[PDB]
Design a binder for this molecule. Structure first.
Ligand SMILES: NC(=O)c1ccc[n+]([C@@H]2O[C@H](COP(=O)([O-])OP(=O)(O)OC[C@H]3O[C@@H](n4cnc5c(N)ncnc54)[C@H](O)[C@@H]3O)[C@@H](O)[C@H]2O)c1
Ligand SMILES: NC(=O)c1ccc[n+]([C@@H]2O[C@H](COP(=O)([O-])OP(=O)(O)OC[C@H]3O[C@@H](n4cnc5c(N)ncnc54)[C@H](O)[C@@H]3O)[C@@H](O)[C@H]2O)c1
Ligand SMILES: [Cl-]
Ligand SMILES: [Fe+2]
Ligand SMILES: [Fe+2]
Lengths: 382, 382
């Protein structure tokens, strides 16, 4: 069968790319924006970075800063509520994954009112209408929500992170500038950083993978690998490299699926508020051993682009080094090695597994996994 | 300053990608297509491959097949006329750069009645309104018109091919299937493929080059350089690999520039009907030399992914090996080595050099060029 690629129709890149917004807005004759963000972001005057411009350029905006980390259905519903009484024409998402995943959730239901429950919207959400135009403005080096046809909501009632996939999500225009992401404390840089490295590795070896996907993913790894460290350290250029590499990572996995790292991280999100990027970080390499045999030459390139001298190693040698370059990046960026450090309880392993076994992402893993494969992975990552 | 990237919001890739067409149209309720093609494409049962699926799916379509290579203003005028007179809702473009570029011309003017003339539309087209939605379907392993933000028209009057650049022109979906491209005779696969390697190389070194665009272009060269031989020699898997290559190149250079090769090829088309890719082909290595010294480490990369063992080389050895790699491909693919061979006239060189100097692409060249520099160039390529 054929392979479909969904990208942003327009995207702006690099420091000050947010400058382009007011004109994008103009060129499309939008009238009012609903900004969708955190209170944290509004307080550090990150949001101001955009709103101020909108002020000079004469552009109407209102705010919903109600998004909490791991955005819940109630959060989504509130935004929709705000949006629908705003007079807003479109929406601007300033934020990482939470506000951005909210905003898409918000945009879809505003045109697919049929789905007001927000659970039906999991899977390949069967939407007849394209979302309210959205301008995506990421402020983390991670999620790549600005480019992905997916968004994840938390359903408190059912303590489960559920994933929505729908080409209708796709922002009209993405503004990716490292200026908006400089605010990120070091822990948050490392976390988002690794979320993307995860994105890129899972995408490289997912089941839908193919030529275009493979190229982008490996690029993004190459970028992330050689930059997350100095970005975590503060060097500004590396922030810009990170900003890019997570964006490249999204061009792939979005259009091609992920795998079980993400499948095991979600339930972990929903169960213990474990920061999504941190979950992945811990699992990633353990899932990489679990996957090593089913990935052809792949890990060899993964080892390469992460600085390892793969030349004349056995495929087994290369497969280790890549898993090892990963363990090594997490430690060097201050991610805690074990699940116990982030307070996972073994009594929960059988649940976590079932939730992982069910999570939409898991299907992409190159190697099918039963309950008891996952029970093990969690145990050995604990 | 910031970089902008303009891409297809949807694209399908893979043998049979046209199959997803009837679907897109339906998912977004258009009503009547104006198919824009060649009489040849019609006659070689190739258009049928799409009209048959649309008939079977219940979709209405009309067709304008009046297009010629290096499409004239009149061709664009006449086509539009037909569209204005068919109740056509959106447009499907089937064919190489010629019907695709004619198709964009039509889609733009039919929304920007302002430039009903087609000269007033050269350069950064001051168009106020997005083109009529165009679904693009290439039948050549070249042009990349399905993803680029530009089209080229022949002014038979002032005889010069001129280039129009406008994000409004971007097709909504692009459909990339080698199945469409199989009919190309070896000379055609050869010509259009090296147009593709020309874009990949020009866009790799063009003035606006940067991280993301370098990545695509370098991937493109890798792919093209690896498959052209086989495509031309008949390999269908080579055909598919190509189909992708040229698209990828499109993703790069649309968003960044080309340079002297296109700038000296456009005035050659206009004067002598020299096919776009053969003009490019002949011209490419010479312009490469002229450019060598102003292209950083780029040639070293170019040479590697064209199979040259750049291992122990100096940037000098390496730059030379790149220009060399191309002379090899041209030979191997059956393109004439000299402009003399394709009817170019020493008398005309001044006029051509002037034309080249004026071409929008030229200014993208890493090495600034003068009239006399272009003269030298045409002369040394003759
Ligand atoms: N299905 C998928 O493809 C998948 C993949 C990746 C991420 N996700 C989703 O992404 C979400 C996580 O998003 P996230 O990690 O970007 O962060 P976030 O939006 O959830 O929150 C991070 C915290 O950091 C603060 N913050 C954010 N940006 C900042 C900055 N620039 N400077 C200072 N402080 C900042 C915020 O206020 C917030 O409290 C989760 O809901 C996750 O499930 C899903
Ligand atoms: N601005 C730019 O970036 C740039 C780059 C590439 C091309 N161009 C322009 O676009 C056009 C290039 O078009 P092209 O090179 O694809 O060729 P084309 O569409 O102009 O036509 C070439 C000939 O090949 C035939 N043909 C095409 N596909 C076929 C198939 N599958 N089977 C059998 N015959 C087939 C056509 O019928 C036609 O006779 C040129 O006119 C050129 O001026 C501009
Ligand atoms: Cl108001
Ligand atoms: Fe993630
Ligand atoms: Fe070309």
């Amino acid at each position: 069968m054929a392979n479909r690629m969904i990208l942003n129709e327009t995207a702006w890149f690099g420091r000050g790319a947010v400058g382009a917004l007011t004109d994008e807005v103009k060129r499309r004759g939008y009238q009012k924006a609903l900004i969708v963000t955190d209170k944290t972001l509004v307080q550090c005057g990150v949001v101001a970075k955009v709103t101020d411009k909108m002020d000079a350029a004469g552009l109407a905006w209102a705010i919903y800063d109600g998004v909490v980390p791991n955005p819940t259905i109630t959060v989504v519903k509130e935004g929709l509520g705000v949006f629908q009484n705003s007079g807003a024409d479109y929406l601007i998402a300033i934020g990482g994954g939470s506000p951005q995943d909210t905003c898409k959730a918000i945009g879809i239901i505003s045109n697919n009112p049929e789905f007001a429950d927000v659970r039906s919207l999991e899977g390949l959400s069967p939407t007849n209408k394209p979302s309210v135009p959205i301008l995506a403005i990421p402020t983390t080096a991670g999620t790549a929500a600005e480019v992905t046809i997916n968004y994840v909501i938390t359903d408190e009632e059912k303590r489960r992170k559920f994933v929505c996939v729908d080409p209708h999500d796709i922002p009209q225009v993405a503004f990716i500038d490292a200026d908006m992401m400089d605010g990120m404390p070091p822990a948050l840089k490392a976390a988002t950083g690794v979320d993307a490295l995860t994105h890129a590795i899972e995408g490289y070896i997912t089941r839908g993978a193919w030529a275009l996907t493979d190229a982008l993913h490996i690029k993004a790894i190459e970028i992330i690998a050689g930059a997350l460290r100095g970005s975590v350290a503060g060097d500004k250029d590396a922030g810009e490299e990170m900003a890019l590499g997570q964006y490249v990572a999204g061009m792939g996995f979005s259009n091609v699926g992920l795998g079980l790292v993400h499948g095991m991280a979600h339930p972990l999100g929903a169960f213990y508020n474990t920061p999504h990027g941190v979950a992945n970080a811990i699992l990633l390499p353990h899932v990489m051993r679990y996957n090593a045999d089913f990935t052809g030459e792949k890990y060899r390139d993964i080892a390469r682009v992460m600085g390892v001298k793969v030349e004349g190693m056995s495929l087994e040698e290369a497969r280790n080094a890549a898993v090892e370059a990963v363990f090594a990046l997490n430690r060097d960026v201050g991610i805690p090695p074990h699940l116990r450090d982030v307070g996972v309880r073994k009594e929960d392993i059988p649940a976590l597994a079932q939730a992982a076994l069910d999570d939409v992402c898991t299907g992409g893993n190159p190697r099918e996994a039963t309950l008891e494969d996952i029970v093990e992975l969690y145990h050995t990552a604990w």
